[PDB]
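Summary of Year 1 activities. Much of the first year was spent building the evaluation harness for sequence design. The harness presents a backbone, in tokenized form, and records the residue chosen at every position. We chose the following record to illustrate the format because it has been used consistently in internal testing since the harness was completed.
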């Protein structure tokens, strides 16, 4: 009855049906472009239980698909295409680059990047596109430093990333992904030292990783690395511009910032609709999911679950702290989440200090939304300060 995907058409609020599903239909039967059956999971308790359940698979051969061409140029050793046990064996090689230890080590870089950017920006003028002139370059520079990827090629890989991450899109999306993967393959053939990509190249020379372990995850890290953080920064600024109380309170007490970052993550929920399939029959809440059925995890719905968050539709930096699923749940829970939280704290703290009188210069209804992207966001954010 319900089509999937449902377009996200409001920056600050997921689709209205999500509320009805959580209340009235928490394991909801829906249909893909070609009528294949999918289940929509909207409550936090069911999202977490199912995403952690060994009968739920991310394996690309049975994954629900959003068009006739979705599935073309699919990777084979990406973290996002591997089930246990392979998944953790591989993820184990990358975890040292993403722990608290390492993330705190990186924070001074991020602060310097952020400060240089805002120096230029304020010197040059009092207007800008916050995504193109600040969020995207911060996020790209950070991931370029971590991986050791030429920041100079940004034009190339940024436009491709953006096109490639539209899962229902036609040949433009597919050509972008093919070209994106050839870009990383060119960079890898060039090492054959520094950064995570140097380290991965080394481990593939020792017996340790395959070429596809290396390629597939370079693409994943580079794309997820910059697209998510750019969007989250942008969108987090947009939200704070609608909340002058919160803007002032965070400027005066930066100790509020770690908490506000979780509340922005929950509220915005830029990652939504994660896809899985069931490899066995699954009984949950009076329904039976059949082996082979598709599963869709409405993280944005679950992050507004009235059973978990009071006044869940309110953005509230003073709410009691509750765990959210903006980063997903189970074995594929965002590997970059410590880095992402640190980037956001740094970026937002700096914006508050350096641009205290920031204003938007276009209406909210006039922003262009990335509704068919896997990473929700806007195409630009015009501001003045
Ligand atoms: C800033 C906001 C970010 C959000 C909201 C976000 C959200 C997510 C979500 C929801 C997943 C799970 C996808 C699935 O289970 O199907 C995920 C996985 C991932 N994230 Fe992020 N992420 C962010 C930032 C980053 C950054 C900065 C990096 C890397 C530098 C990154 C690297 C990854 C990787 C490698 C995975 C796959 C992990 C696995 O399958 O084991 N993320 N992220
Ligand atoms: C919800 C945040 C999560 O987002 C995804 O994991 C999106 C991830 O599913 C793409 C959408 C997906 O793109 C789709 O890949 C298909 C095989 C293609 O057939 C399809 N066609 C249209 C080009 C392409 O769009 C990725 C390939 C599968 O992993 C794209 C590459 C660049 C990639 O690995 C991107 C990963 C990102 C952005 C992960 C963040 C954390």
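For this record, the design step produced the sequence shown next.
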């Amino acid at each position: 009855s319900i089509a999937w995907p449902v377009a996200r058409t409001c920056p600050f609020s997921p689709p209205e049906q999500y509320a009805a599903l959580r209340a009235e239909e928490p394991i909801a039967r829906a249909e893909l472009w070609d009528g294949a059956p999918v289940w929509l999971i909207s409550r936090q308790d069911h999202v977490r239980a199912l995403l952690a359940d060994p009968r739920v698979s991310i394996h690309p051969a049975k994954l629900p698909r959003l068009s006739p061409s979705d599935g073309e140029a699919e990777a084979s050793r990406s973290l996002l295409t591997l089930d246990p046990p392979d998944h953790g064996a591989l993820r184990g090689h990358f975890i040292p680059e993403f722990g608290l230890r390492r993330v705190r080590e990186l924070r001074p870089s991020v602060e310097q990047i952020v400060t240089g950017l805002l120096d230029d920006l304020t010197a040059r003028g009092d207007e800008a596109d916050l995504l193109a002139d600040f969020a995207l370059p911060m996020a790209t520079q950070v991931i370029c430093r971590l991986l050791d990827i030429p920041y100079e090629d940004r034009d190339y890989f940024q436009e491709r990333t953006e096109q490639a991450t539209r899962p229902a899109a036609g040949e433009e999306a597919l050509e972008a992904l093919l070209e994106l993967r050839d870009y990383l393959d060119r960079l890898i053939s060039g090492k054959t030292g520094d950064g995570m990509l140097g380290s991965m190249v080394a481990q593939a020379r020792g017996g340790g990783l395959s070429h596809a372990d290396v390629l597939d995850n370079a693409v994943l890290l580079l794309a997820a690395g910059h697209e998510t953080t750019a969007s989250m920064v942008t969108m987090s600024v947009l939200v704070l511009l609608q909340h002058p109380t919160a803007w002032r309170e965070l400027t005066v007490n930066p100790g509020l910032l770690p908490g506000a970052v979780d509340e922005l993550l929950r509220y915005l929920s830029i990652a939504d609709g994660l896809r899985r399939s069931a490899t066995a029959d699954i009984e949950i809440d009076g329904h039976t999911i059949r082996a082979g059925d598709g599963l869709v995890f409405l993280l944005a719905a679950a992050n507004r679950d009235e059973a978990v968050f009071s006044e869940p539709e309110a953005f509230d930096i003073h709410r009691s702290a509750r765990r959210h699923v903006a980063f997903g749940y189970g074995p594929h829970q965002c590997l970059g989440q410590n880095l992402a939280r640190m980037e956001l704290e740094v970026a937002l703290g700096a914006v508050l200090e350096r641009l205290p009188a920031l204003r938007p210069t276009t209406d909210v209804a006039g922003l262009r939304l990335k509704s068919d992207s896997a990473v929700f966001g806007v195409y630009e954010l015009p501001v003045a300060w």
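Residues 79-80, 91, 143, 220-221, 224-225, 228-229, 232, 270-271, 274, 326-328, 332, 334-336, 339-340 surround protoporphyrin IX containing FE (ligand 1) (CB under 6 Å). Quantitative recovery figures across the full test set are reported in Table 2.
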